Design an enzyme around this catalytic site. Structure first.
Site, PDB file in Angstrom:
ATOM      1  CB  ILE B 156      12.138 -53.737  -6.726  1.00 23.81           C
ATOM      2  CG1 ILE B 156      12.374 -52.632  -6.058  1.00 23.81           C
ATOM      3  CG2 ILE B 156      10.999 -54.853  -5.813  1.00 23.81           C
ATOM      4  CD1 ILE B 156      11.160 -51.624  -5.907  1.00 23.81           C
ATOM      5  CD  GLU B 175      10.934 -57.166 -17.073  1.00 23.97           C
ATOM      6  OE1 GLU B 175      10.633 -56.712 -18.020  1.00 23.97           O
ATOM      7  OE2 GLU B 175      11.617 -56.591 -15.757  1.00 23.97           O
ATOM      8  N   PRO B 235       4.719 -54.187  -3.542  1.00 29.04           N
ATOM      9  CG  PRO B 235       6.684 -54.921  -3.806  1.00 29.04           C
ATOM     10  CD  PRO B 235       5.152 -55.241  -4.235  1.00 29.04           C
ATOM     11  CB  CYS B 236       5.523 -51.711  -7.729  1.00 32.84           C
ATOM     12  SG  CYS B 236       4.214 -52.729  -8.382  1.00 32.84           S
ATOM     13  NE  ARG B 237       4.517 -45.062  -7.843  1.00 32.76           N
ATOM     14  CZ  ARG B 237       5.555 -45.034  -6.646  1.00 32.76           C
ATOM     15  NH1 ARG B 237       5.995 -45.833  -5.783  1.00 32.76           N
ATOM     16  NH2 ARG B 237       6.522 -44.162  -6.941  1.00 32.76           N
ATOM     17  CG  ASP B 261       5.261 -50.019   1.348  1.00 29.71           C
ATOM     18  OD1 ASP B 261       4.913 -49.860   2.287  1.00 29.71           O
ATOM     19  OD2 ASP B 261       6.040 -49.464   0.684  1.00 29.71           O
ATOM     20  CD  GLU B 266       0.875 -44.343  -1.850  1.00 22.56           C
ATOM     21  OE1 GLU B 266       0.990 -45.434  -1.761  1.00 22.56           O
ATOM     22  OE2 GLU B 266       1.855 -43.744  -1.128  1.00 22.56           O
ATOM     23  CG  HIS B 292       4.836 -45.051  -0.376  1.00 18.81           C
ATOM     24  ND1 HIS B 292       4.493 -44.611  -1.302  1.00 18.81           N
ATOM     25  CD2 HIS B 292       6.256 -45.413  -0.928  1.00 18.81           C
ATOM     26  CE1 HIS B 292       5.124 -44.969  -2.505  1.00 18.81           C
ATOM     27  NE2 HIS B 292       6.422 -45.305  -2.198  1.00 18.81           N
ATOM     28  CB  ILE B 293       7.260 -47.858   5.488  1.00 19.89           C
ATOM     29  CG1 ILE B 293       6.753 -49.136   5.581  1.00 19.89           C
ATOM     30  CG2 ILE B 293       6.286 -46.713   6.287  1.00 19.89           C
ATOM     31  CD1 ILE B 293       7.064 -49.844   7.197  1.00 19.89           C
ATOM     32  N   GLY B 294       8.486 -48.566   2.039  1.00 22.12           N
ATOM     33  CA  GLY B 294       9.471 -49.462   1.313  1.00 22.12           C
ATOM     34  C   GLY B 294      11.150 -48.900   1.520  1.00 22.12           C
TER      35      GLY B 294
END
Ligand SMILES: NC(=O)c1ccc[n+]([C@@H]2O[C@H](COP(=O)([O-])OP(=O)(O)OC[C@H]3O[C@@H](n4cnc5c(N)ncnc54)[C@H](O)[C@@H]3O)[C@@H](O)[C@H]2O)c1
Ligand SMILES: NC(=O)c1ccc[n+]([C@@H]2O[C@H](COP(=O)([O-])OP(=O)(O)OC[C@H]3O[C@@H](n4cnc5c(N)ncnc54)[C@H](O)[C@@H]3O)[C@@H](O)[C@H]2O)c1
Lengths: 329, 330
Positions: B156, B175, B235-237, B261, B266, B292-294
């Site tokens: 991503i 990273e 957009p991950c968790r 997202d 969840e 969660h519509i990623g």
């Protein structure tokens, strides 16, 4: 007595500081637009005007404001300003050619994503408190593997094409004046006829000015060509589309969505312009709207104001303003 | 009698046709999520399972289902699935490594633009019927000349970097597994420390998996480093951030915005997970949310389902699945 400058809308205080030594300032440091009556009253003996999107200048305005030397427009599309009438009265008319391009391009792409992914309704659902985890819904349309068609390929068209390079779409455009083939290839753009553009595009992004030739260009007949579910994004001028035809296309489900930053009701030079946005369009679910915020990025607005200010100061000093649209002796 | 496959959520007809001549299908062709007990009941004698984001498989689940040979997940982040317990009980766990990446990256950039430009409030204003023309309002933040910081540069992260190439932003990243210099140069990326990433970025884009090390990584201490007005996009968790600390950062006005997202509620594998999103976070103006519509793109979901189906079929045929997360002796 310094030359009198009327600034019709709120600007940064440092722009006022830049102007104050050279100009007697008549300002509007509020978020409100003044009545046409009050603008006329202020401009009657003004030497200069900094104008914004809500402003309209015709021959009748100019005859009522005989002292004007320059109208410095803090905008790109000067469709509500009669340039020929300005030239006739010996009035400089200046614009901002480049500074609005990028933030408008950014917003147009964000609207395309927002529209295709049902962002308004998706966000409404989360805010409701009823999100219970991932569900099979709000299925939308992405840019990957889509055909994106641009009507217009000037500043904003090119900026949008630049920004879609990593996105896996097939890009095509229609123009009144074509790009050189070298630039087309650097951007992966193919030139097509207007009819074909509307018949073959999954996303249609408008990027053209408003004039006598583009007025209601996007009409019922052209919209009837689109693939069922096609998405239409308008960041340019409201009146390049017929919003009644757009709404009808949405209601029949041929048009999958309409996103707009601009509206027919804003196009003041149009006598037959609607007085508002149709409430049925405003309430349609397959839409996403913004109130003419294409250039509404803090740093850029200051730069836009400075550009208009500089043009006005050049004119008042007896120079040809750098961004003049017209020519005076 | 063919092996029983429990598909927990609705699946395209093209996928059922692919599966039918191989499995006895216990399907759920509704758009409703069944209860934990209902899944247990159906999976008790199942050889295979197609699992989705709402599903959670733990040690007790596999113990109650001794017949399972494969769990094919139609997703990327398998944090709700005990891979170690799967391996211990000889059960293949498979995922979808690449298909979710692009639509999620698209949405994430969309959220960054929407958040920076006050899209929710702007749209609500036009819809109110009170728009009368341009006003010097809704001035926001663009990506041009901005510093964009990526926390994570895997699938991503890379897709988002790809999609920002013509945007005039300065791209930097932190990273666990650093890129080689030639890739960094190719994308105009500069590697920075996590603390510097959070201190120097106008937009912070999260692109991390959720695991023991990443749980509440974005916490109060880290959020204390951000520039005033910094925008955070997740957009991950959900549980990579402390949503309570995010809200506090929004309220003091240090964090300029939060778009997500995904949400902490969840993350089923957590016992102490909040049971909802804080109403106060939902009500904050400097936010933008999606449920969660990623990867919720029709064309893409069909492909995700086919991938998960292919993995299940491979396992049931006695092959090792192409997208197995774990390894099993043959
Ligand atoms: N929403 C905003 O805040 C915002 C900001 C900037 C500009 N605008 C509007 O967007 C318009 C376009 O902006 P720009 O900066 O790209 O202008 P530009 O003049 O640089 O480009 C306009 C292009 O449209 C082309 N064109 C003209 N008629 C056409 C037709 N019939 N079919 C196809 N193409 C045609 C022209 O050849 C030109 O290349 C402006 O005129 C202005 O009205 C809106
Ligand atoms: N919203 C959605 O619909 C959706 C879709 C796909 C994935 N996701 C989630 O997003 C996560 C990331 O997705 P991906 O496809 O990029 O996964 P990926 O495994 O390809 O990339 C994850 C990267 O993050 C890096 N990383 C791990 N810990 C780190 C740390 N502490 N600091 C910096 N970097 C670290 C890893 O080295 C790896 O390169 C997934 O695990 C999944 O949970 C969400």
């Amino acid at each position: 007595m310094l030359p009198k400058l009327v600034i019709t809308h709120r600007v940064h205080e440092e722009i006022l500081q830049l102007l104050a030594p050279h100009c007697e300032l008549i300002t509007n440091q509020t978020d409100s637009t003044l009545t046409r009556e009050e603008i006329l009253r202020r401009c009657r003996d003004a030497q200069a005007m900094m104008a914004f999107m809500p402003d309209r200048v015709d021959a009748d305005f100019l005859q009522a404001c005989p002292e004007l030397r320059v109208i410095g427009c803090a905008l790109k599309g000067f469709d509500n300003f009669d340039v020929d009438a300005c030239t006739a009265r010996g009035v400089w008319l200046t614009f901002v050619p480049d500074l609005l391009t990028v933030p408008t391009a950014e917003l147009a792409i964000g609207l395309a994503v927002g529209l295709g992914r049902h962002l308004r309704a998706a966000d409404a659902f989360v805010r409701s408190g009823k999100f219970r985890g991932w569900q099979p819904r709000f299925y939308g349309t992405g840019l990957d593997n889509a055909t994106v068609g641009f009507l217009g390929m000037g500043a904003i068209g090119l900026a949008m094409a630049d920004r879609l390079q990593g996105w896996g779409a097939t890009l095509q455009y229609h123009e009144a004046k074509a790009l050189d083939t070298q630039t087309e290839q650097r951007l992966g753009l193919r030139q097509v006829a207007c009819s074909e553009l509307f018949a073959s595009s999954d996303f249609i992004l408008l990027a053209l000015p408003l004039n006598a030739d583009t007025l209601h260009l996007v009409n019922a007949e052209l919209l009837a060509l689109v693939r069922p579910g096609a998405l239409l994004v308008n960041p340019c001028r409201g009146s390049v589309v017929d919003e009644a035809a757009v709404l009808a296309a949405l209601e029949r489900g041929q048009l999958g969505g309409y996103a707009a930053d601009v509206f027919e009701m804003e196009d003041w030079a149009r006598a037959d312009r609607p007085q508002q946005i149709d409430p049925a369009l405003l309430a349609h679910p397959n839409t996403l709207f913004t109130p003419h915020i294409g250039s509404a990025v803090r740093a850029v607005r200051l730069e836009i104001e400075r550009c208009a200010a500089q043009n006005i100061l050049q004119a008042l000093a007896g120079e040809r303003p750098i961004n003049a649209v017209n020519r005076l002796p």
